[PDB]
Design a protein around this nucleic acid. Structure first.
Lengths: 280, 280
DNA sequence: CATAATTTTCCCATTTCCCCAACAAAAAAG
DNA sequence: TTTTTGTTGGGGAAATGGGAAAATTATGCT
């Protein structure tokens, strides 16, 4: 089913079958594959794509732009992003029902329940399903998008100690490629949220460790949003610890960035937090 | 050659061949493929990966962690970025020589020559080759990483109007998704640099267009670096156009962000620019 | 207009892959 | 023994590679 869009891509680049053919694939097989008549192995498909100067990510994206993007987990988080952004609780809660067309696996149900916990405190993930998701994450080899998102939304639902331990493992086991730092950016955001939660719990050794780790992640990475929330994180850290004038200075500076960059909502939430810190 | 790392992945998630076996692929074929004995079509490999909760990029990244990467345009820009950061002019220029173990295609040579132009004014791409790369980009269908990087690194070498036209075409033809917001970030950076060059040439209608377009790209995209350079861009815009009191404030706000976070050198570049503008 | 280019596609040699079974084989059920 | 998993063959089915028609485009010149 892929070959059709290979034809589309090839003709858009005004390249002939004769050109993309090489010692690795005969012209006839390209003709057949592009016509949905036969299927070629992934290795040779990558070879042909490289001839055309297009990534497999780019090609599969163009191919999913036509046809359909079926139940993936990528489309699941996409859908939850759209609903949560709109604040449609009864649209997300429906993913747990029987009649749902998006199907959730146990860990997916745990993650959705934990996301719904922020929209409604009454929606609580069971102690057992949470310990099962922790069981899974503790026995991971290399962390992909899947495991990252699973941990990321349950940072405040699973036991703290478990959360920090899993964060430490994630930092030194997740899949990363320089040409796509999406996983890296999400990991940095998760680490910073774990840092905020660590200052909440007053475990300053975990705080120091995560501050160094986040520093490393941020280094020569133009993720100024993460840098800003991390500046506020270091401020919260130094305030909880000693009530440092440099910490409150950093916390003020972060809201100042959120002001210059007209990010109204971020500035507002990080102002209301600072208010509770200075009121009490 | 792929199957081996699939085995690794499968063994890391501690799931059996019987588990990933389904209506689409027999167990024996998985055994053989993982043993480097037979090859499955990309569709079936995608299916097996989907069962294992891993992207095809994630999987190919793990596969490239071992073995070796056939040096491509992706790895070429990887290398040139690393060298440019370190300021190794002769290490970049060596890519054009006989002795280079990267064989650069004509447009790749044009891009490298243009990268060397910023490091040395004497290195200028010929009038012919720049028009050759422009001709290529003008007859592109969908803009992938290749075409985007080619334009982005030649924004100041090809004809201004040609560059702006190619930018306008790129904004409405590039490949974009969600599991990879990389290309969108690069496109936003390119648009903002085209905006700076548009204020340089004083084509304020092009500026207006790019301001709206960049606005659209940035919306609820936490690219505070792009937002900062765009705030300074709008400041330069309003200053050159009207000598606006609001524009100098915007430029000051952007330099303020670059200081507040602590990106020293960015602060230096955008300070030297503001200094020359307020001096003259 | 007609003819001459390329791009493409249609059939058939053989190689290779693949589902169905039977085994081979370590576990973690009893 | 009790579900389980990793690795083998054999009829069958595809997927390939190499040649010629047929659809599509570029031009033959008076």
């Amino acid at each position: 089913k892929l070959g059709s869009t290979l034809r589309k891509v090839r003709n858009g680049k005004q390249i002939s079958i004769c050109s993309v053919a090489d010692e690795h694939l005969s012209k006839s097989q390209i003709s057949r594959f592009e016509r949905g008549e036969s299927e070629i192995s992934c290795i040779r498909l990558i070879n042909i794509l490289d001839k055309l100067h297009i990534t497999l990510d780019e090609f599969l994206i163009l191919h999913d732009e036509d046809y359909t993007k079926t139940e993936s987990f990528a489309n699941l988080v996409q859908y939850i992003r759209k609903q949560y952004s709109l604040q449609n609780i009864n649209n997300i809660q429906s993913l747990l029902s029987d009649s749902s067309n998006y199907t959730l696996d146990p860990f997916e149900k745990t993650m959705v329940k934990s996301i719904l916990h922020t929209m409604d405190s009454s929606i609580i993930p069971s102690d057992d399903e949470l310990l099962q998701l922790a069981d899974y994450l503790f026995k991971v080899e290399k962390w992909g998008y899947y495991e990252i998102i699973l941990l990321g939304n349950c940072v405040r639902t699973i036991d703290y100690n478990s959360v920090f331990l899993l964060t430490k493992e994630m930092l030194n086991n997740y899949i990363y490629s320089s040409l796509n730092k999406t996983n890296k950016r999400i990991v940095t955001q998760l680490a910073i949220n774990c840092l905020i939660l660590s200052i909440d719990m007053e475990e300053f050794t975990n705080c120091f460790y995560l501050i160094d780790e986040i520093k490393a992640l941020l280094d020569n990475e133009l993720n100024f949003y993460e840098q800003t929330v991390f500046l506020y994180a270091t401020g919260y850290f130094e305030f909880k610890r000693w009530q440092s004038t440099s910490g409150i200075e950093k916390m003020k500076q972060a809201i100042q960035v959120l002001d210059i960059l007209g990010e109204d909502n971020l500035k507002l939430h990080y102002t209301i937090h600072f208010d509770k810190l200075i009121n009490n």
